[PDB]
Ligand SMILES: O[C@]1(c2ccc(-c3ccccc3)cc2)CN2CCC1CC2
């Protein structure tokens with residue numbers, strides 16, 4: 012194990028820990044691709060957690076500065092303020108692949124707003140949040156996941172990320188509330204006559220299930236649309252991206268079976284992950 016090798020192993024560790032599902036799927040990529048994924052993910056995770064876990068804006072700005080250092084001087088040695096193991100690895104990927112740095116900055120901008128949390132008025136704002144937090148990631152990943160870095164490849168990758176995020180939100184309703192966040196739009200909550208506080212207290216009624224299912228359908232519709240254009244990605248990434256999505260779609264069904272609980276985090280078992288991988292490989 013070289014030094015860089017250890018830097019990537021640490022990134023791999025962060026991904027296994029925080030996103031078992033993405034880990035399960037993207038670890039099947041060729042070595043050079045999965046390492047890139049590990050690093051890009053770890054950066055994104057670090058950005059997220061600096062607000063969501065530490066609520067530490069100063070930390071957040073260290074990371075942006077690190078990435079900025081990288082973008083500017085890809086080939087100079089940086090005393091990263093941030094987490095030097097991750098930034099060393101990102102810097103390494105940057106040397107070999109084209110990194111959409113503005114997409115990282117869009118992420119940082121969006122995660123920043125979570126620190127002074129205000130609710131969205133409309134769905135279009137929630138959708139813009141999904142771009143900012145997940146669509147951006149799809150953009151950063153795009154050069155890794157396909158050989159055609161065109162606007163149409165990007166469009167599918169964006170929608171992939173945003174649908175993943177919407178599903179993340181639909182799993183996290185309870186725990187986001189306990190964190191005093193609601194990501195359902197005010198528009199849609201009123202229209203459906205849902206109050207998350209109230210629903211948190213006395214359980215899940217018919218008006219909540221309708222609203223949740225309204226967003227689910229959108230995520231499921233969007234995933235379908237991505238799955239059609241799966242060809243945009245490389246041969247090797249196609250079945251992986253299909254798996255990663257199938258798993259995350261299965262998260263919706265798990266919420267459903269647990270009757271939409273706002274009081275635990277549902278998950279897909281490794282055992283069902285394996286199942287899905289089988290279901291998928293017959294066709295590849
Ligand atoms: O930033 C997230 C993310 C991670 C990965 C993808 C993805 C995007 C496109 C394709 C595959 C995966 C999207 C979002 C979302 N949010 C929680 C998870 C990490 C950290 C902040």
Ligand SMILES: [Mg+2]
Pocket residue numbers: 059063122125
């Ligand atoms: Mg977040």
Ligand SMILES: [Mg+2]
Pocket residue numbers: 059060063
């Ligand atoms: Mg978070």
Ligand SMILES: [Mg+2]
Pocket residue numbers: 179180183
């Ligand atoms: Mg979440």
